[model samples]
Structures are given as structure tokens and as C-alpha cells.
Target: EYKCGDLVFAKMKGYPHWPARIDEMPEASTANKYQVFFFGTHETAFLGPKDLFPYEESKEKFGKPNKRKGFSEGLWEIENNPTVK
Candidate 1:
């Protein structure tokens, strides 16, 4: 059960993929079980435990996708980014 402000590494590339932490486990059924966020070399995005991936590892598997439209740019500077706490 990961709490807010804890940096975690996701095994999956996109949102709601494996290795995600327990960010906001909403009680509402319509809500998502875990709010997963990813910071890749390109972009970042947050999503529920289910979503479509953008990339592929092989002919069969797909790689994680970026949906934040470059939200991860300078993500490492969370302290300076107003979006982050």
C-alpha cells in the first residue's frame, strides 16, 4: 500500500499497469482501484488499473504508452513542478 509522495518504479510502461502502487483506492465502483503514474523518457500519465498501451516489446506484446502529452518533461524536478507536492 503505497502512500502519497512515495516514488515507485512501475514494471509496466503505461497507466494502471503492473508494479503500480496503491495511490488512490477509491471506494466508488466507478472509480479506479489504483492510480498509477509513470515517468518515461518521453512523457507521463495517470490512469486506473485498466487502459490501452502505446508501445510493443515484440511482435505480440506491446510497450507502455504515454498519454500526458509530455507531462513527464522534467518530472524529476518535482520540487519545482507545481503539479507535484
Candidate 2:
């Protein structure tokens, strides 16, 4: 069973990636659904047990990007996009 504050991976709906943390695990009215949060964007959603997986199981899959630096660069890229102006 997953617990709060656990770093997990979730292929969140509409997101093309899977790297999130378990922010909350409320008692589900259904059999195996959860409300989760993603650290990178602080977005939350309801998900099924299958929607989340242990970080350890897929650490290597994420390929070790420097989280802080990478996000900052991504932000800069978006802000400077000429089409966005």
C-alpha cells in the first residue's frame, strides 16, 4: 500500500510524463483509487492504484535530470518563445 509523502511516479492523465509524489491518500469510496499530487507542477487528481507506481521501480527510466536547473531552463524557453509574444 502507498503512503503519504512517498515519491512516486504517475503517468498523469493528459501529461506525457510520469514523475510525481504521493501527496495524499484519502480513504477511497471505491476499491483502489487515490488522490495524488505532482511536485513539478503541484497538480492533483484522482487516480487508480494502477496509475501510481513505486519510484524505485522506475528511477532509471526518468534518466536523472537536474530537477531545479531543468525546470528553470524550460521556463526560460517558454517565456522567450517568439510565437508566444
Candidate 3:
């Protein structure tokens, strides 16, 4: 089980890869799901257990982490950036 402040990998919508931190895991309406916060994007969203994974595990599978671009402009820019796809 994950705890607050734990660095984990989560492939959020529109993001190319997992890059998130566990801010909180609140009580969910369903099981094995969590309310997560991605500090890199300064956003929060619900994710299932399958959606979250250990950073080390992800690194081994996905190669070195790549720097996320357009984050300074906030969610709208990052979500809509054509170059991201």
C-alpha cells in the first residue's frame, strides 16, 4: 500500500508517462482506487491501484524519466499541447 509523500509513477490523462507523487489517498466509493495529486502538474485526480506503481519499477520498464514540457503554463497548456502527442 502507498502512503502520503511517496513518489510514484502514474500515467495521467494526456501525459506521455508516469510522473506523480502521492499526496493523499482518500476514501473512495470503490475499492483499490485513490485520490492522487501530481505535483509536477499541480493537479489531482482519481486513480486505480493499477494506475499507480513504484518509481523504480517504472524506471526499469520505461527507461530514464524525461522532463515534462509546458508545465510552467499550467494544466491547460500541457493538456492541449500538440507536441506532447
Candidate 4:
């Protein structure tokens, strides 16, 4: 019963929880994958079912990702992607 505009947090396999908006969801909650767009990075990718979760307070501060005035990416970055920083 959700639309594409639905905003939620998604966690990539090795990435942390980041704000992402739903582009499309084929199946129901039983689905194990979904189409989403990352906020800061502005990249679109498919996420796992368990990775996509709704917001708690429903107060998502990020709408237009570019509206963010900073050189930083989202909550996490690839900088820590390696074994150890």
C-alpha cells in the first residue's frame, strides 16, 4: 500500500544504514529485493528485503539530496569500505 515516493532507510550488504527513497517494489513484504535511490550519493540500486525498513519518527529531514550543502556524502562513506581504516 506504499507509493514510490515512500522514503526509507536501506542498508547495503557492507554499507551502513542510509536514507533512501523507494523507486519500485515488485512483490510484497515477502520480497527479498527492491529498487531504491540513495539520497546523498544520488545513485540508484537494488536492495535486499531485510535491508529496506521504514522510518521510526517519520521525520525524514532529507528530501532533495542536492539540497544538502556539504561536501560530505550520506551518513556513511566508502572511506571505511576497506578492511580497516
TM-scores for all candidates?
A: 0.30, 0.60, 0.58, 0.54
Report, for all candidates in order, the number of backbone clashes: 3, 0, 0, 0
What lDDT score is found at residue 55 in candidate 2? 66
Model 3 CA deviation exceeding 4 Å by range: 28-31, 63-85
Ranked by lDDT, top first = 3, 4, 2, 1
- Per-residue lDDT over 1-85 for candidate 1, one digit per residue giving the tens place of the 0 to 100 score: 3344344444444433322223443455555544544433333445543442322222124223435444334233334322332
For residues 1-85, what per-residue lDDT tens digits would candidate 4 score against the true structure?
4456566777776555666667776577456567787755677788665676664433344222343432145433323221111
Question: Residue 2 error for model 4, in Å?
Answer: 4.5
Looking at model 1, how many pairs of residues clash? 3
Tens-digit lDDT track for model 2 on 1-85? Answer: 7876666566655554455656656675554666766554455676777777766677666525544523334223323322111
Alpha-carbon lDDT, every model:
0.37, 0.55, 0.57, 0.56
Which numbered prediction scores highest in lDDT against the true structure? 3
Better of 2 and 4 by TM-score: 2
> In candidate 1, which residue pairs get closer than 3 Å at backbone N, Cα or C atoms, i.e. clash?
55-63, 56-62, 56-63
Off by over 4 Å in 4: 27-32, 57-85
RMSD (Cα, Å) for all candidates, in order, is: 8.8, 9.1, 8.2, 10.0
**Model 4: how far residue 60 lies from native, Å:** 9.3
Candidate 3, residues 8-83: lDDT per residue as tens digits?
6677677754555666655545456666665445567778777888655665574344556633343333243222
